[PDB]
Each structure stands twice: as structure tokens, then as C-alpha cells.
């Protein structure tokens, strides 16, 4: 237990093609609620969940101005990092930021996050104590020293322990109809003969929320982890998720195989078989 708020920023330099593109998305648990795109005709923070639409102009305008200023800060950081790594002025580079708060069932802060990546790999992150940094390479040691001198960890900590927890509490209350609601998976086992001697058993879980789930195949009660093809949990497009797990079995062994489904929406985990 129990909830998180996270922001995901992506800045991409485009040398000789103008300013870097800045995109931000905000989430409460597995639900996206806001976005900002510097490439849009009139960049502004926009609602992406019905429950955030009630916020006043002071909310949207304050946030729009933060994103526009953050995009400018990211443009300078991209310039500074290109120099740290002695990289050409022509190549495109990416700077990603991910931050937010995790709260327990009593609404109190469990963990704060403030992490950065450059060109797809860890660059610098705020430690669990929210007072110190972890640089992933010598270039990031330069940023670490700048942020230690500028007392950046205190500025992040102030938000993570204060505002972050308070906004999450407000959003949870406004969006409880969806945010707290269990949406159990709808489950079924399909059977697909491959030849006269082998068949695929595929265990489906559909229309579930939250995204967290475990699907496993057992044979006579023994885990078939190594022989199971498991796809990544995918969005259905209606704020629910889907997943499946398949196993190739010799014909005649089907009834010895059982699919185990674990999800918060279910009172007890399920044990399912092909129901011909």
C-alpha cells in the first residue's frame, strides 16, 4: 500500500532544427492525468483524466509556466552535458527526468524519487534520504558538485515531503471512483493445436486495473516459468490492461496444466484450466 504521483519529462535536442522538444506527462498510480508538449501550436498543460478538469486557471497557468521554464532549464542542461561528454554539436541527445512521491495507506510519505537519465542511461539520482545524490559517471560528478553547492537536494526534498504528498491526497479524493476501484481481470484459457501432437494453452487476463498482476502456468502443481511465453502487460486503451501467458504442451497433457491469476481485484487467486 498504497499510492504514487509521478512526473515523466523528456527533452530531445534537435541540432539545426530549433529548440529541443520538451514533453511532460503526469500520473497518479497507473492513470495519466496531465500532459504538456513544447511542440504543440500553443503549449499548455492539458487535462488527461476527467477528475483533473475541475482545476481552475491558476492551476493550469502555474503549471504551464513551470513546464516552459523547465524546458528552458533542460535546454541549458543538454548544452552542458554535450560539453561534459565532449560530444559533437550535430547529434541528437535525450535528457529524461522522473520524480514523485509514494504514500502509504495513511497518506504519509513512504519514498521520494528524483532521477535523471542522459541518452537512455542513469545520470544522477536523489538518494532515499532526499539529502544526497548518486552520480552514475564522471560527467554526473560535475552536476553533483553544482547541485550540492546550490542546495538542490533541499529544494527537491521540500516538494517531495510537502506539496507532492498534498497534491496526491487531493487527486486521490477527486478521482476515487477510478483510482481506488478494483477492476478484476476477466480470465479464460484458449487452446490452439500446433500439430497432431502439440498444442498451445494461452491464459488470458483482460480489462483489469491496476496494471499489477501475476499469471503463471503450473503442470501437476510445478511452475513452468522457463517454458512459459509471457507478454508485457499492455494498455487496452480504455484505462484498463491486458496480459497473457502461453505454454506449448504435448497433446493429452492439457488437463495437468493450470493457470494461476493473482490481482488486487480478486478476493482469492484463481486456478484455471482449458474448459473444452
Amino acid at each position: 500500500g498504497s499510492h504514487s504521483m509521478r512526473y515523466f519529462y523528456t527533452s530531445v535536442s534537435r541540432p539545426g532544427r530549433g529548440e529541443p522538444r520538451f514533453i511532460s506527462v503526469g500520473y497518479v498510480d497507473d492513470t495519466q492525468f496531465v500532459r504538456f508538449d513544447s511542440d504543440a501550436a500553443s503549449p499548455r498543460e492539458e487535462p488527461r483524466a476527467p477528475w483533473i478538469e475541475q482545476e481552475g486557471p491558476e492551476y493550469w497557468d502555474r503549471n504551464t509556466q513551470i513546464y516552459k521554464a523547465q524546458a528552458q532549464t533542460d535546454r541549458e542542461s543538454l548544452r552542458n552535458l554535450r560539453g561534459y561528454y565532449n560530444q559533437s554539436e550535430a547529434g541528437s541527445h535525450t535528457l529524461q527526468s522522473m520524480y514523485g512521491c509514494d504514500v502509504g495507506p495513511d497518506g504519509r510519505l513512504l519514498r521520494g524519487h528524483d532521477q535523471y537519465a542522459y541518452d537512455g542511461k542513469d545520470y544522477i539520482a536523489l538518494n532515499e534520504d532526499l539529502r544526497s545524490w548518486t552520480a552514475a559517471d564522471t560527467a554526473a560528478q560535475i552536476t553533483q558538485r553544482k547541485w550540492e553547492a546550490a542546495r538542490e537536494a533541499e529544494q527537491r526534498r521540500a516538494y517531495l515531503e510537502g506539496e507532492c504528498v498534498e497534491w496526491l491526497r487531493r487527486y486521490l479524493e477527486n478521482g476515487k471512483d477510478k483510482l481506488e476501484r478494483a477492476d478484476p481481470p476477466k480470465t479464460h484459457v484458449t487452446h490452439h493445436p500446433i500439430s497432431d501432437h502439440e498444442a498451445t494453452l494461452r491464459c488470458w487476463a483482460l480489462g483489469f486495473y491496476p496494471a499489477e498482476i501475476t499469471l503463471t502456468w503450473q503442470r501437476d502443481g510445478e511452475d513452468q516459468t522457463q517454458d512459459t511465453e509471457l507478454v508485457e502487460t499492455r494498455p487496452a486503451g480504455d484505462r484498463t490492461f491486458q496480459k497473457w501467458a502461453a505454454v506449448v504442451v504435448p497433446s493429452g497433457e492439457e488437463q495437468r496444466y493450470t493457470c494461476h491469476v493473482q490481482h488486487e481485484g480478486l478476493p482469492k487467486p484463481l486456478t484455471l484450466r482449458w474448459e473444452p
Binding site: 503549471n63 520524480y99 535523471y116 544522477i124
Partner: peptide, 9 residues
């Protein structure tokens, strides 16, 4: 709501 912007890296 988002955090107020950081110092440059």
C-alpha cells in the same frame, strides 16, 4: 502539480 524548475545540470 509539478515541481518548480531545477538549477541547470
Amino acid at each position: 502539480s509539478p515541481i518548480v524548475p531545477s538549477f541547470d545540470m
